[PDB]
Amino acid sequence: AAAA
Amino acid sequence: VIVPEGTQLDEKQHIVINNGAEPQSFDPHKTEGVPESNVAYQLLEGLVTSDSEGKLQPGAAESWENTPDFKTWTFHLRKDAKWSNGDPVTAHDFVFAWRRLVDPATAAPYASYLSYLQVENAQDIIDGKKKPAELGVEAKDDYTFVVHATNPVPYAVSLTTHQSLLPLPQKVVEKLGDAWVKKENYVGNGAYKLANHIINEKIEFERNPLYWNDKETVINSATFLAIENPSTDVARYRAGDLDMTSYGLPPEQFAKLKKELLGEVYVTRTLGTYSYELNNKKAPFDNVNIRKALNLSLDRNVITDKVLGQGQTPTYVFTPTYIEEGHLIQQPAYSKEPMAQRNEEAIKLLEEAGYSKANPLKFSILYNTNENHKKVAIAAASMWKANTKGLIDVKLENQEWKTYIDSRRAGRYDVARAGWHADYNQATTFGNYFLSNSSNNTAKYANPEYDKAMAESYAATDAEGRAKAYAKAEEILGKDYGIVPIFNYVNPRLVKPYVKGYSGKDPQDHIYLRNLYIIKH
Protein backbone atom coordinates (compact mmCIF):
# COMPACT_ATOMS: atom_id res chain seq x y z
CA ALA A 1 0.00 0.00 0.00
CA ALA A 2 1.30 3.51 -0.84
CA ALA A 3 2.08 5.33 2.42
CA ALA A 4 0.81 8.93 3.01
CA VAL B 1 -15.09 -9.52 24.86
CA ILE B 2 -12.37 -6.93 23.76
CA VAL B 3 -12.96 -4.99 27.03
CA PRO B 4 -11.17 -6.38 30.16
CA GLU B 5 -13.76 -7.38 32.85
CA GLY B 6 -14.66 -4.55 35.27
CA THR B 7 -13.33 -1.74 32.95
CA GLN B 8 -15.35 1.49 33.13
CA LEU B 9 -16.31 2.23 29.54
CA ASP B 10 -17.31 5.74 28.57
CA GLU B 11 -20.99 6.13 27.57
CA LYS B 12 -20.61 7.98 24.22
CA GLN B 13 -17.89 5.84 22.47
CA HIS B 14 -16.89 8.50 19.92
CA ILE B 15 -13.35 8.84 18.52
CA VAL B 16 -11.60 11.30 16.18
CA ILE B 17 -8.61 10.06 14.18
CA ASN B 18 -6.45 11.90 11.68
CA ASN B 19 -6.49 9.92 8.43
CA GLY B 20 -3.91 12.33 6.94
CA ALA B 21 -5.41 13.13 3.49
CA GLU B 22 -8.60 13.16 1.42
CA PRO B 23 -8.93 9.60 -0.01
CA GLN B 24 -9.03 9.07 -3.80
CA SER B 25 -12.11 6.84 -3.50
CA PHE B 26 -14.07 4.60 -1.17
CA ASP B 27 -14.08 1.84 -3.85
CA PRO B 28 -11.30 -0.66 -2.98
CA HIS B 29 -10.79 -1.42 -6.70
CA LYS B 30 -9.96 2.21 -7.49
CA THR B 31 -7.32 2.92 -4.83
CA GLU B 32 -3.84 1.99 -3.66
CA GLY B 33 -3.05 4.12 -0.56
CA VAL B 34 -3.21 4.00 3.25
CA PRO B 35 -5.86 6.81 3.60
CA GLU B 36 -8.12 4.80 1.24
CA SER B 37 -7.53 1.47 2.97
CA ASN B 38 -8.23 3.01 6.40
CA VAL B 39 -11.71 3.98 5.15
CA ALA B 40 -12.40 0.68 3.28
CA TYR B 41 -11.47 -1.41 6.35
CA GLN B 42 -14.26 0.23 8.42
CA LEU B 43 -16.95 -0.34 5.74
CA LEU B 44 -16.04 -3.78 4.32
CA GLU B 45 -14.47 -7.02 5.64
CA GLY B 46 -12.64 -9.72 3.68
CA LEU B 47 -12.10 -13.43 4.26
CA VAL B 48 -9.57 -12.81 7.04
CA THR B 49 -8.89 -9.72 9.16
CA SER B 50 -6.55 -8.79 12.00
CA ASP B 51 -6.44 -7.87 15.70
CA SER B 52 -4.73 -4.88 17.27
CA GLU B 53 -1.31 -6.62 17.09
CA GLY B 54 -1.69 -7.57 13.41
CA LYS B 55 -2.44 -11.26 14.14
CA LEU B 56 -4.82 -12.91 11.69
CA GLN B 57 -8.37 -13.72 12.75
CA PRO B 58 -11.55 -14.94 10.98
CA GLY B 59 -13.38 -12.23 9.02
CA ALA B 60 -16.09 -12.99 6.52
CA ALA B 61 -14.75 -16.61 6.51
CA GLU B 62 -15.13 -18.50 9.80
CA SER B 63 -12.80 -21.36 8.62
CA TRP B 64 -10.46 -22.19 5.79
CA GLU B 65 -7.95 -24.81 4.65
CA ASN B 66 -5.43 -25.51 1.89
CA THR B 67 -4.42 -28.57 -0.10
CA PRO B 68 -0.92 -29.79 0.86
CA ASP B 69 0.55 -28.39 -2.46
CA PHE B 70 -0.53 -24.82 -1.31
CA LYS B 71 -2.49 -24.36 -4.55
CA THR B 72 -6.14 -24.81 -3.47
CA TRP B 73 -7.60 -22.49 -0.78
CA THR B 74 -11.12 -23.11 0.49
CA PHE B 75 -12.98 -20.56 2.61
CA HIS B 76 -16.11 -21.31 4.64
CA LEU B 77 -18.31 -18.23 4.87
CA ARG B 78 -20.71 -17.34 7.73
CA LYS B 79 -24.19 -18.57 6.89
CA ASP B 80 -26.10 -15.68 8.56
CA ALA B 81 -23.76 -12.76 7.53
CA LYS B 82 -25.40 -9.81 5.81
CA TRP B 83 -24.66 -6.62 3.94
CA SER B 84 -25.70 -3.33 5.56
CA ASN B 85 -28.93 -3.32 3.39
CA GLY B 86 -29.91 -6.84 4.57
CA ASP B 87 -28.73 -8.79 1.46
CA PRO B 88 -26.82 -12.02 2.35
CA VAL B 89 -23.02 -12.09 2.00
CA THR B 90 -22.17 -15.10 -0.16
CA ALA B 91 -19.25 -16.60 -2.08
CA HIS B 92 -20.82 -15.00 -5.17
CA ASP B 93 -19.95 -11.57 -3.78
CA PHE B 94 -16.31 -12.67 -3.49
CA VAL B 95 -16.33 -14.16 -7.02
CA PHE B 96 -17.88 -10.92 -8.30
CA ALA B 97 -15.39 -8.65 -6.48
CA TRP B 98 -12.26 -10.60 -7.40
CA ARG B 99 -13.35 -10.72 -11.09
CA ARG B 100 -13.99 -6.96 -11.00
CA LEU B 101 -10.47 -6.39 -9.60
CA VAL B 102 -8.69 -8.00 -12.63
CA ASP B 103 -11.33 -6.87 -15.22
CA PRO B 104 -9.47 -4.44 -17.54
CA ALA B 105 -12.58 -2.24 -17.63
CA THR B 106 -12.07 -1.55 -13.88
CA ALA B 107 -8.53 -0.24 -14.54
CA ALA B 108 -7.69 -1.14 -10.91
CA PRO B 109 -4.32 0.13 -9.55
CA TYR B 110 -4.12 -3.17 -7.64
CA ALA B 111 -5.22 -5.43 -10.53
CA SER B 112 -1.90 -7.29 -10.16
CA TYR B 113 -2.73 -8.43 -6.59
CA LEU B 114 -4.55 -11.59 -7.84
CA SER B 115 -1.53 -12.22 -10.10
CA TYR B 116 0.64 -12.09 -7.00
CA LEU B 117 -1.65 -14.77 -5.45
CA GLN B 118 -0.95 -16.86 -8.60
CA VAL B 119 -4.69 -17.29 -9.20
CA GLU B 120 -5.35 -19.29 -12.37
CA ASN B 121 -5.86 -16.94 -15.35
CA ALA B 122 -5.61 -13.66 -13.25
CA GLN B 123 -2.66 -12.36 -15.31
CA ASP B 124 -4.32 -13.42 -18.56
CA ILE B 125 -7.43 -11.48 -17.64
CA ILE B 126 -5.37 -8.40 -16.70
CA ASP B 127 -3.66 -8.74 -20.12
CA GLY B 128 -7.00 -8.93 -22.07
CA LYS B 129 -6.41 -12.56 -23.17
CA LYS B 130 -9.26 -14.16 -21.15
CA LYS B 131 -12.64 -12.98 -19.91
CA PRO B 132 -13.00 -12.12 -16.18
CA ALA B 133 -15.38 -15.15 -15.72
CA GLU B 134 -12.36 -17.39 -16.49
CA LEU B 135 -10.72 -16.42 -13.20
CA GLY B 136 -9.85 -19.48 -11.10
CA VAL B 137 -12.14 -18.70 -8.19
CA GLU B 138 -15.60 -20.17 -7.65
CA ALA B 139 -18.57 -20.41 -5.36
CA LYS B 140 -18.74 -24.17 -4.84
CA ASP B 141 -21.98 -23.22 -3.01
CA ASP B 142 -23.41 -20.04 -1.49
CA TYR B 143 -21.07 -20.22 1.56
CA THR B 144 -17.94 -21.91 0.07
CA PHE B 145 -15.40 -19.81 -1.84
CA VAL B 146 -12.50 -21.68 -3.48
CA VAL B 147 -9.30 -20.12 -4.83
CA HIS B 148 -7.21 -22.08 -7.37
CA ALA B 149 -3.55 -21.01 -7.72
CA THR B 150 -1.14 -22.23 -10.49
CA ASN B 151 1.89 -22.13 -8.16
CA PRO B 152 2.38 -22.82 -4.42
CA VAL B 153 1.54 -19.77 -2.30
CA PRO B 154 1.93 -20.89 1.35
CA TYR B 155 1.44 -17.25 2.55
CA ALA B 156 -1.96 -17.07 0.70
CA VAL B 157 -4.15 -16.45 3.77
CA SER B 158 -2.15 -13.32 4.80
CA LEU B 159 -2.72 -11.85 1.28
CA THR B 160 -6.50 -12.07 1.69
CA THR B 161 -6.51 -9.35 4.40
CA HIS B 162 -5.68 -6.63 1.80
CA GLN B 163 -8.20 -3.90 0.78
CA SER B 164 -8.14 -4.99 -2.89
CA LEU B 165 -9.66 -8.40 -1.90
CA LEU B 166 -12.59 -6.98 0.11
CA PRO B 167 -15.97 -8.30 -1.11
CA LEU B 168 -18.38 -5.92 -2.90
CA PRO B 169 -22.21 -6.12 -2.83
CA GLN B 170 -22.76 -7.73 -6.27
CA LYS B 171 -26.52 -7.00 -6.40
CA VAL B 172 -25.83 -3.28 -5.71
CA VAL B 173 -22.77 -2.72 -7.89
CA GLU B 174 -24.31 -4.60 -10.88
CA LYS B 175 -27.33 -2.24 -10.67
CA LEU B 176 -25.58 1.10 -9.86
CA GLY B 177 -22.15 0.69 -11.49
CA ASP B 178 -19.30 2.87 -10.20
CA ALA B 179 -21.92 5.16 -8.55
CA TRP B 180 -22.45 2.44 -5.85
CA VAL B 181 -19.68 4.23 -3.91
CA LYS B 182 -21.70 7.41 -3.28
CA LYS B 183 -22.76 7.80 0.37
CA GLU B 184 -26.49 7.42 -0.50
CA ASN B 185 -25.74 4.10 -2.31
CA TYR B 186 -22.82 2.54 -0.34
CA VAL B 187 -23.49 -0.91 1.04
CA GLY B 188 -20.87 -2.90 3.04
CA ASN B 189 -20.33 -5.84 5.37
CA GLY B 190 -17.89 -4.12 7.80
CA ALA B 191 -18.43 -2.81 11.31
CA TYR B 192 -19.30 0.81 10.24
CA LYS B 193 -21.17 2.70 7.55
CA LEU B 194 -20.73 6.24 6.12
CA ALA B 195 -22.75 8.88 8.00
CA ASN B 196 -21.20 11.88 6.21
CA HIS B 197 -18.36 12.92 3.93
CA ILE B 198 -17.18 16.53 3.49
CA ILE B 199 -14.30 16.68 0.96
CA ASN B 200 -11.09 17.94 2.56
CA GLU B 201 -12.72 18.15 6.02
CA LYS B 202 -14.04 14.90 7.48
CA ILE B 203 -15.54 11.44 7.06
CA GLU B 204 -18.09 10.41 9.70
CA PHE B 205 -18.71 6.77 10.48
CA GLU B 206 -21.62 5.21 12.34
CA ARG B 207 -22.16 1.65 13.57
CA ASN B 208 -23.37 -0.90 10.97
CA PRO B 209 -25.96 -2.75 13.14
CA LEU B 210 -26.12 -5.51 10.50
CA TYR B 211 -22.36 -6.35 10.84
CA TRP B 212 -22.09 -10.08 11.78
CA ASN B 213 -20.05 -9.19 14.89
CA ASP B 214 -21.88 -5.94 15.85
CA LYS B 215 -22.43 -7.31 19.34
CA GLU B 216 -18.64 -7.11 20.03
CA THR B 217 -18.18 -3.63 18.43
CA VAL B 218 -17.72 -0.90 21.06
CA ILE B 219 -17.07 2.40 19.18
CA ASN B 220 -20.45 3.90 18.18
CA SER B 221 -19.16 6.69 15.89
CA ALA B 222 -15.89 8.06 14.59
CA THR B 223 -14.56 10.98 12.64
CA PHE B 224 -11.63 10.76 10.25
CA LEU B 225 -9.85 14.13 9.62
CA ALA B 226 -7.67 14.96 6.63
CA ILE B 227 -4.81 16.94 8.15
CA GLU B 228 -1.75 16.81 5.87
CA ASN B 229 0.88 18.32 8.19
CA PRO B 230 2.07 16.47 11.32
CA SER B 231 2.44 19.75 13.27
CA THR B 232 -1.21 20.59 12.61
CA ASP B 233 -2.12 17.00 13.67
CA VAL B 234 -0.24 17.44 16.95
CA ALA B 235 -1.78 20.91 17.53
CA ARG B 236 -5.34 19.50 17.18
CA TYR B 237 -4.44 16.59 19.46
CA ARG B 238 -3.12 18.97 22.18
CA ALA B 239 -6.19 21.22 21.86
CA GLY B 240 -8.17 17.99 22.67
CA ASP B 241 -9.90 18.05 19.26
CA LEU B 242 -8.66 14.65 18.01
CA ASP B 243 -7.78 11.42 19.83
CA MET B 244 -5.21 9.69 17.56
CA THR B 245 -2.72 11.33 15.18
CA SER B 246 -1.72 9.91 11.84
CA TYR B 247 1.65 8.14 11.72
CA GLY B 248 3.96 11.20 11.45
CA LEU B 249 5.11 13.55 14.21
CA PRO B 250 7.27 16.71 13.86
CA PRO B 251 10.92 15.67 14.40
CA GLU B 252 11.75 18.84 16.34
CA GLN B 253 8.87 18.27 18.82
CA PHE B 254 9.30 14.52 19.27
CA ALA B 255 11.65 14.62 22.33
CA LYS B 256 9.52 17.08 24.26
CA LEU B 257 6.29 15.24 23.34
CA LYS B 258 7.67 12.06 24.95
CA LYS B 259 8.54 14.04 28.12
CA GLU B 260 5.15 15.81 28.46
CA LEU B 261 2.68 13.19 27.17
CA LEU B 262 3.53 10.15 29.34
CA GLY B 263 2.44 6.91 27.64
CA GLU B 264 0.68 8.77 24.80
CA VAL B 265 3.62 8.51 22.34
CA TYR B 266 3.55 5.24 20.40
CA VAL B 267 6.20 4.13 17.96
CA THR B 268 5.39 1.06 15.92
CA ARG B 269 8.21 -0.70 14.04
CA THR B 270 6.51 -1.33 10.68
CA LEU B 271 7.19 -3.28 7.49
CA GLY B 272 7.73 -0.23 5.34
CA THR B 273 10.31 1.39 3.09
CA TYR B 274 10.65 5.09 2.28
CA SER B 275 12.32 5.70 -1.10
CA TYR B 276 12.81 8.17 -3.87
CA GLU B 277 11.42 6.44 -6.94
CA LEU B 278 13.29 7.27 -10.19
CA ASN B 279 11.26 7.33 -13.42
CA ASN B 280 13.23 4.62 -15.27
CA LYS B 281 11.67 5.52 -18.66
CA LYS B 282 12.13 9.35 -18.43
CA ALA B 283 15.41 10.98 -19.48
CA PRO B 284 17.81 11.23 -17.91
CA PHE B 285 16.86 8.61 -15.30
CA ASP B 286 16.82 5.94 -18.02
CA ASN B 287 20.65 6.17 -17.61
CA VAL B 288 21.90 3.62 -15.02
CA ASN B 289 24.99 5.80 -14.45
CA ILE B 290 22.89 8.72 -13.19
CA ARG B 291 20.63 6.44 -11.06
CA LYS B 292 23.84 5.10 -9.55
CA ALA B 293 25.27 8.61 -8.95
CA LEU B 294 22.08 9.64 -7.01
CA ASN B 295 22.30 6.53 -4.82
CA LEU B 296 26.02 6.94 -4.01
CA SER B 297 25.71 10.64 -3.07
CA LEU B 298 22.61 10.39 -0.78
CA ASP B 299 23.65 9.92 2.84
CA ARG B 300 20.79 7.95 4.50
CA ASN B 301 22.12 8.50 8.07
CA VAL B 302 21.61 12.30 7.69
CA ILE B 303 17.88 11.74 7.07
CA THR B 304 17.36 9.04 9.69
CA ASP B 305 19.58 10.50 12.44
CA LYS B 306 19.50 14.26 11.82
CA VAL B 307 16.26 15.15 9.97
CA LEU B 308 13.86 12.62 11.58
CA GLY B 309 15.61 10.76 14.46
CA GLN B 310 12.47 8.89 15.64
CA GLY B 311 13.85 5.36 15.08
CA GLN B 312 13.77 5.16 11.26
CA THR B 313 16.68 2.92 10.12
CA PRO B 314 18.75 3.51 6.96
CA THR B 315 18.39 1.01 4.15
CA TYR B 316 19.73 0.65 0.59
CA VAL B 317 17.34 -2.11 -0.59
CA PHE B 318 13.58 -2.06 -1.20
CA THR B 319 12.52 -5.07 0.91
CA PRO B 320 12.83 -4.66 4.74
CA THR B 321 15.34 -7.44 5.59
CA TYR B 322 13.44 -8.21 8.86
CA ILE B 323 10.29 -9.25 6.91
CA GLU B 324 9.55 -12.97 6.87
CA GLU B 325 11.73 -14.74 4.22
CA GLY B 326 13.69 -11.47 3.74
CA HIS B 327 16.66 -12.48 5.85
CA LEU B 328 19.10 -13.41 2.99
CA ILE B 329 18.74 -9.99 1.31
CA GLN B 330 22.09 -8.14 1.50
CA GLN B 331 22.74 -4.40 1.78
CA PRO B 332 24.85 -3.35 -1.29
CA ALA B 333 28.68 -3.00 -1.00
CA TYR B 334 28.70 0.81 -1.64
CA SER B 335 26.63 1.26 1.54
CA LYS B 336 29.81 0.24 3.48
CA GLU B 337 32.14 2.72 1.61
CA PRO B 338 32.99 6.09 3.27
CA MET B 339 30.85 8.98 1.92
CA ALA B 340 34.07 10.59 0.52
CA GLN B 341 34.67 7.61 -1.81
CA ARG B 342 30.93 7.45 -2.73
CA ASN B 343 30.81 11.14 -3.53
CA GLU B 344 34.00 11.02 -5.65
CA GLU B 345 32.45 8.11 -7.67
CA ALA B 346 29.15 10.05 -8.05
CA ILE B 347 30.88 13.19 -9.33
CA LYS B 348 32.81 11.16 -11.95
CA LEU B 349 29.57 9.52 -13.18
CA LEU B 350 27.81 12.91 -13.49
CA GLU B 351 30.72 14.52 -15.35
CA GLU B 352 30.81 11.51 -17.71
CA ALA B 353 27.07 12.25 -18.22
CA GLY B 354 27.96 15.85 -19.10
CA TYR B 355 26.96 17.76 -15.95
CA SER B 356 28.98 20.54 -14.30
CA LYS B 357 28.47 23.37 -11.77
CA ALA B 358 27.43 25.57 -14.71
CA ASN B 359 25.15 22.91 -16.29
CA PRO B 360 23.94 20.82 -13.33
CA LEU B 361 21.56 17.87 -13.39
CA LYS B 362 18.18 19.56 -12.73
CA PHE B 363 15.01 17.77 -11.61
CA SER B 364 12.08 18.08 -9.20
CA ILE B 365 11.20 15.88 -6.23
CA LEU B 366 7.46 15.24 -6.33
CA TYR B 367 5.94 14.61 -2.89
CA ASN B 368 2.54 14.72 -1.25
CA THR B 369 1.93 17.89 0.81
CA ASN B 370 3.33 17.06 4.25
CA GLU B 371 5.90 19.17 6.15
CA ASN B 372 7.87 16.04 7.16
CA HIS B 373 8.25 15.03 3.49
CA LYS B 374 9.29 18.61 2.70
CA LYS B 375 11.99 18.46 5.34
CA VAL B 376 13.36 15.17 3.97
CA ALA B 377 13.27 16.53 0.37
CA ILE B 378 15.06 19.77 1.44
CA ALA B 379 17.75 17.67 3.10
CA ALA B 380 18.01 15.38 0.01
CA ALA B 381 18.24 18.37 -2.35
CA SER B 382 20.91 19.89 -0.06
CA MET B 383 22.99 16.69 0.16
CA TRP B 384 22.81 16.02 -3.60
CA LYS B 385 24.06 19.56 -4.38
CA ALA B 386 26.84 19.69 -1.76
CA ASN B 387 28.00 16.07 -2.05
CA THR B 388 28.46 16.45 -5.87
CA LYS B 389 30.07 19.96 -5.60
CA GLY B 390 27.19 21.65 -7.43
CA LEU B 391 26.49 19.08 -10.22
CA ILE B 392 22.87 18.45 -9.08
CA ASP B 393 20.23 21.22 -8.61
CA VAL B 394 16.92 19.90 -7.17
CA LYS B 395 13.55 21.72 -7.02
CA LEU B 396 10.68 20.61 -4.73
CA GLU B 397 7.15 20.01 -6.01
CA ASN B 398 4.29 19.29 -3.56
CA GLN B 399 0.89 18.03 -4.70
CA GLU B 400 -2.25 17.09 -2.79
CA TRP B 401 -2.35 13.27 -2.15
CA LYS B 402 -4.90 12.45 -4.92
CA THR B 403 -3.00 14.53 -7.47
CA TYR B 404 0.39 13.12 -6.34
CA ILE B 405 -0.81 9.48 -6.77
CA ASP B 406 -2.22 10.40 -10.24
CA SER B 407 1.10 12.04 -11.23
CA ARG B 408 3.12 8.99 -10.15
CA ARG B 409 0.77 6.59 -12.00
CA ALA B 410 0.81 8.80 -15.14
CA GLY B 411 4.65 8.94 -15.16
CA ARG B 412 4.50 12.76 -14.86
CA TYR B 413 7.52 12.95 -12.55
CA ASP B 414 11.35 12.72 -12.48
CA VAL B 415 11.92 11.63 -8.87
CA ALA B 416 9.03 10.97 -6.44
CA ARG B 417 8.88 10.43 -2.76
CA ALA B 418 7.46 6.93 -2.26
CA GLY B 419 6.53 4.84 0.76
CA TRP B 420 5.56 1.20 0.47
CA HIS B 421 3.91 -0.58 3.43
CA ALA B 422 3.54 -4.34 3.43
CA ASP B 423 0.20 -5.72 2.22
CA TYR B 424 1.05 -9.03 4.00
CA ASN B 425 3.95 -10.06 6.26
CA GLN B 426 6.10 -11.93 3.70
CA ALA B 427 8.92 -10.71 1.38
CA THR B 428 6.94 -10.92 -1.92
CA THR B 429 4.76 -7.95 -0.86
CA PHE B 430 7.93 -5.94 -1.70
CA GLY B 431 9.49 -8.16 -4.41
CA ASN B 432 6.30 -8.33 -6.47
CA TYR B 433 6.24 -4.50 -6.73
CA PHE B 434 9.12 -4.44 -9.21
CA LEU B 435 7.92 -7.17 -11.61
CA SER B 436 7.89 -5.72 -15.15
CA ASN B 437 4.16 -6.24 -15.47
CA SER B 438 3.12 -5.13 -11.89
CA SER B 439 0.25 -2.60 -11.81
CA ASN B 440 1.99 -1.16 -8.67
CA ASN B 441 5.29 -0.48 -10.57
CA THR B 442 5.11 3.33 -11.05
CA ALA B 443 8.94 3.40 -11.42
CA LYS B 444 8.57 1.73 -14.84
CA TYR B 445 11.39 -0.60 -13.81
CA ALA B 446 11.60 -3.70 -16.10
CA ASN B 447 14.33 -6.37 -16.03
CA PRO B 448 13.46 -9.90 -17.37
CA GLU B 449 16.22 -11.22 -15.06
CA TYR B 450 14.44 -9.68 -12.03
CA ASP B 451 11.16 -11.31 -13.11
CA LYS B 452 12.98 -14.67 -13.60
CA ALA B 453 14.58 -14.48 -10.12
CA MET B 454 11.18 -13.84 -8.55
CA ALA B 455 9.58 -16.67 -10.59
CA GLU B 456 12.12 -19.20 -9.18
CA SER B 457 10.58 -18.69 -5.71
CA TYR B 458 7.48 -20.78 -6.80
CA ALA B 459 9.80 -23.65 -7.80
CA ALA B 460 11.24 -23.59 -4.26
CA THR B 461 9.80 -26.13 -1.81
CA ASP B 462 10.79 -24.35 1.41
CA ALA B 463 11.34 -21.00 3.07
CA GLU B 464 15.11 -21.06 2.44
CA GLY B 465 14.63 -21.62 -1.28
CA ARG B 466 12.11 -18.75 -1.45
CA ALA B 467 14.43 -16.49 0.59
CA LYS B 468 17.32 -17.21 -1.80
CA ALA B 469 15.21 -16.27 -4.84
CA TYR B 470 14.11 -13.02 -3.16
CA ALA B 471 17.78 -12.18 -2.33
CA LYS B 472 18.77 -12.66 -6.00
CA ALA B 473 15.90 -10.42 -7.20
CA GLU B 474 16.90 -7.64 -4.81
CA GLU B 475 20.55 -8.02 -5.98
CA ILE B 476 19.43 -7.45 -9.57
CA LEU B 477 17.25 -4.49 -8.61
CA GLY B 478 20.25 -3.07 -6.64
CA LYS B 479 22.73 -3.40 -9.56
CA ASP B 480 20.22 -1.56 -11.78
CA TYR B 481 19.82 1.31 -9.18
CA GLY B 482 16.11 1.14 -10.04
CA ILE B 483 15.17 3.38 -7.08
CA VAL B 484 16.81 5.25 -4.12
CA PRO B 485 15.73 3.40 -0.93
CA ILE B 486 16.22 5.64 2.15
CA PHE B 487 14.82 4.08 5.34
CA ASN B 488 12.69 1.44 6.97
CA TYR B 489 9.75 2.98 8.76
CA VAL B 490 8.64 3.53 12.25
CA ASN B 491 5.13 4.90 12.73
CA PRO B 492 5.10 7.48 15.56
CA ARG B 493 1.64 8.46 16.75
CA LEU B 494 0.00 10.25 19.65
CA VAL B 495 -2.91 8.30 21.23
CA LYS B 496 -4.96 9.72 24.11
CA PRO B 497 -4.85 7.88 27.47
CA TYR B 498 -8.60 7.16 27.31
CA VAL B 499 -8.18 5.35 23.92
CA LYS B 500 -7.66 1.60 24.35
CA GLY B 501 -7.04 -1.22 21.83
CA TYR B 502 -4.12 0.41 19.98
CA SER B 503 -1.07 -1.85 20.55
CA GLY B 504 1.98 -0.21 19.06
CA LYS B 505 2.92 -3.74 17.87
CA ASP B 506 1.04 -4.18 14.56
CA PRO B 507 3.74 -4.39 11.83
CA GLN B 508 1.21 -2.99 9.28
CA ASP B 509 -0.16 -0.41 11.87
CA HIS B 510 -3.82 -0.81 10.86
CA ILE B 511 -6.52 0.94 12.83
CA TYR B 512 -9.80 -0.93 12.87
CA LEU B 513 -12.44 1.00 14.78
CA ARG B 514 -13.93 -2.37 15.86
CA ASN B 515 -10.71 -3.02 17.90
CA LEU B 516 -10.88 0.23 19.95
CA TYR B 517 -12.81 1.39 23.06
CA ILE B 518 -12.97 4.57 25.15
CA ILE B 519 -12.46 4.16 28.94
CA LYS B 520 -13.97 6.46 31.56
CA HIS B 521 -11.30 7.17 34.28
Side-chain angles (χ1 to χ4, degrees), chain B residues 73 113 149 176 189 242 248:
Chain B
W73 298 81
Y113 202 70
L176 293 188
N189 70 322
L242 65 76

mmCIF file of all heavy atoms in Angstrom, chain B residues 73 113 149 176 189 242 248:
data_model
loop_
_atom_site.group_PDB
_atom_site.id
_atom_site.type_symbol
_atom_site.label_atom_id
_atom_site.label_comp_id
_atom_site.label_asym_id
_atom_site.label_seq_id
_atom_site.Cartn_x
_atom_site.Cartn_y
_atom_site.Cartn_z
ATOM 1 N N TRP B 73 -7.281 -23.201 -2.012
ATOM 2 C CA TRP B 73 -7.600 -22.493 -0.781
ATOM 3 C C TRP B 73 -9.111 -22.396 -0.699
ATOM 4 O O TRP B 73 -9.717 -21.837 -1.594
ATOM 5 C CB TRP B 73 -6.926 -21.111 -0.753
ATOM 6 C CG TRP B 73 -5.440 -21.254 -0.791
ATOM 7 C CD1 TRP B 73 -4.671 -21.466 -1.899
ATOM 8 C CD2 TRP B 73 -4.556 -21.388 0.336
ATOM 9 N NE1 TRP B 73 -3.359 -21.654 -1.533
ATOM 10 C CE2 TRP B 73 -3.257 -21.606 -0.176
ATOM 11 C CE3 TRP B 73 -4.723 -21.285 1.724
ATOM 12 C CZ2 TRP B 73 -2.138 -21.746 0.652
ATOM 13 C CZ3 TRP B 73 -3.614 -21.389 2.541
ATOM 14 C CH2 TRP B 73 -2.345 -21.638 2.009
ATOM 15 N N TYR B 113 -2.745 -7.717 -7.894
ATOM 16 C CA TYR B 113 -2.730 -8.425 -6.594
ATOM 17 C C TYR B 113 -3.145 -9.896 -6.793
ATOM 18 O O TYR B 113 -2.615 -10.755 -6.177
ATOM 19 C CB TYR B 113 -3.600 -7.668 -5.580
ATOM 20 C CG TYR B 113 -3.257 -7.961 -4.143
ATOM 21 C CD1 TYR B 113 -2.084 -7.517 -3.562
ATOM 22 C CD2 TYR B 113 -4.129 -8.690 -3.352
ATOM 23 C CE1 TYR B 113 -1.790 -7.764 -2.231
ATOM 24 C CE2 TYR B 113 -3.812 -9.016 -2.050
ATOM 25 C CZ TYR B 113 -2.655 -8.536 -1.475
ATOM 26 O OH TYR B 113 -2.386 -8.813 -0.173
ATOM 27 N N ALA B 149 -4.812 -21.620 -7.322
ATOM 28 C CA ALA B 149 -3.549 -21.007 -7.721
ATOM 29 C C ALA B 149 -2.738 -21.981 -8.610
ATOM 30 O O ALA B 149 -2.770 -23.178 -8.400
ATOM 31 C CB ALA B 149 -2.781 -20.618 -6.498
ATOM 32 N N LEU B 176 -25.931 -0.341 -9.925
ATOM 33 C CA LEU B 176 -25.584 1.097 -9.858
ATOM 34 C C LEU B 176 -24.292 1.440 -10.613
ATOM 35 O O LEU B 176 -24.001 2.600 -10.800
ATOM 36 C CB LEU B 176 -25.454 1.509 -8.387
ATOM 37 C CG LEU B 176 -26.742 1.481 -7.572
ATOM 38 C CD1 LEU B 176 -26.496 2.095 -6.210
ATOM 39 C CD2 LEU B 176 -27.882 2.213 -8.274
ATOM 40 N N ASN B 189 -20.202 -4.750 4.426
ATOM 41 C CA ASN B 189 -20.332 -5.844 5.373
ATOM 42 C C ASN B 189 -19.369 -5.683 6.555
ATOM 43 O O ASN B 189 -19.259 -6.620 7.348
ATOM 44 C CB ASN B 189 -20.070 -7.190 4.701
ATOM 45 C CG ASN B 189 -18.615 -7.383 4.314
ATOM 46 O OD1 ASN B 189 -17.951 -6.442 3.876
ATOM 47 N ND2 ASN B 189 -18.106 -8.611 4.448
ATOM 48 N N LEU B 242 -8.727 15.993 18.615
ATOM 49 C CA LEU B 242 -8.664 14.650 18.013
ATOM 50 C C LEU B 242 -7.941 13.735 18.989
ATOM 51 O O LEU B 242 -7.281 14.235 19.897
ATOM 52 C CB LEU B 242 -8.015 14.673 16.623
ATOM 53 C CG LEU B 242 -6.551 15.055 16.448
ATOM 54 C CD1 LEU B 242 -5.588 13.946 16.858
ATOM 55 C CD2 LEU B 242 -6.283 15.417 14.990
ATOM 56 N N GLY B 248 2.809 10.289 11.525
ATOM 57 C CA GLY B 248 3.955 11.204 11.447
ATOM 58 C C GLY B 248 3.878 12.220 12.562
ATOM 59 O O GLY B 248 2.797 12.722 12.847
#
